[PDB]
Design an enzyme around this catalytic site. Sequence first.
Site, mmCIF file in Angstrom:
data_model
loop_
_atom_site.group_PDB
_atom_site.id
_atom_site.type_symbol
_atom_site.label_atom_id
_atom_site.label_comp_id
_atom_site.label_asym_id
_atom_site.label_seq_id
_atom_site.Cartn_x
_atom_site.Cartn_y
_atom_site.Cartn_z
ATOM 1 N NE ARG A 54 -2.772 1.581 3.282
ATOM 2 C CZ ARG A 54 -3.405 2.624 3.814
ATOM 3 N NH1 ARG A 54 -4.384 3.236 3.265
ATOM 4 N NH2 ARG A 54 -2.917 3.027 5.047
ATOM 5 C CG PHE A 59 -0.433 9.044 3.744
ATOM 6 C CD1 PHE A 59 0.041 9.396 5.050
ATOM 7 C CD2 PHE A 59 -1.512 8.185 3.683
ATOM 8 C CE1 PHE A 59 -0.532 8.856 6.145
ATOM 9 C CE2 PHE A 59 -2.044 7.608 4.809
ATOM 10 C CZ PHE A 59 -1.627 8.026 6.035
ATOM 11 C CD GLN A 62 -0.153 -0.030 5.728
ATOM 12 O OE1 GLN A 62 -0.656 1.089 5.481
ATOM 13 N NE2 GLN A 62 -0.844 -0.987 6.306
ATOM 14 C CG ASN A 101 -3.047 0.619 14.763
ATOM 15 O OD1 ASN A 101 -4.157 0.936 14.336
ATOM 16 N ND2 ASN A 101 -2.244 1.506 15.418
ATOM 17 C CG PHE A 112 3.127 3.835 8.338
ATOM 18 C CD1 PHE A 112 2.437 3.203 9.410
ATOM 19 C CD2 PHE A 112 3.237 5.271 8.447
ATOM 20 C CE1 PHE A 112 1.951 3.910 10.481
ATOM 21 C CE2 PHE A 112 2.738 5.950 9.541
ATOM 22 C CZ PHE A 112 2.084 5.244 10.554
ATOM 23 C CG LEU A 121 -1.189 8.849 11.297
ATOM 24 C CD1 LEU A 121 -0.272 7.983 10.459
ATOM 25 C CD2 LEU A 121 -2.611 8.266 11.293
ATOM 26 C CG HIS A 125 -0.770 4.530 13.632
ATOM 27 N ND1 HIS A 125 -0.964 3.332 12.981
ATOM 28 C CD2 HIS A 125 -1.897 5.280 13.458
ATOM 29 C CE1 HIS A 125 -2.183 3.357 12.441
ATOM 30 N NE2 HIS A 125 -2.773 4.508 12.699
#
Length: 164
Positions: A54, A59, A62, A101, A112, A121, A125
């Site tokens: 991903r 951004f 991942q 998660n 990531f 985040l 995270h």
Amino acid sequence: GNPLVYLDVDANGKPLGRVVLELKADVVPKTAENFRALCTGEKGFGYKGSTFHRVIPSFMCQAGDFTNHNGTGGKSIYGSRFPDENFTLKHVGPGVLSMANAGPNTNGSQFFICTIKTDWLDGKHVVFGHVIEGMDVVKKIESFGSKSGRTSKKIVITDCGQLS
Ligand SMILES: CCOC(=O)CNC(=O)NCc1ccccc1
Ligand SMILES: [K+]
Ligand SMILES: [K+]
């Protein structure tokens, strides 16, 4: 000292280079140790041969679903999931290494690398390290992502391990 680990990444079997990470064992020992061991493969399973599944430009990138290869899976060296250790480190900018998660206390193996500051985040995270060398390599991975997260080439961790 803190572990220094590496990921050697390819795109459709072509090498992109090496990403070197510091793991903040002095702040999050249990989280750092999980990742370290998944890099070396010493428990009999780990990141070698798995994918960045991903990738969202502007951004993050991942990875870490070495069972299902699609974001549903992964597992830790402790068991299927482990608690959030602490939220002391923050998502301060590009190069932050953080756990993916599915809600509180659901850490496994997915992680990531940020390509922007992802401060929304913080407290959700667990941050556990950062990029020491190879942000250019991370920007190459990022180039093969899209706004949906789907990648345009297969992006594979061909090797990984511990440097010190
Ligand atoms: C930028 C971080 O985004 C995520 O963590 C979004 N959530 C995920 O992709 N979670 C997939 C997942 C992560 C760990 C355990 C099961 C599934
Ligand atoms: K967005
Ligand atoms: K290795």
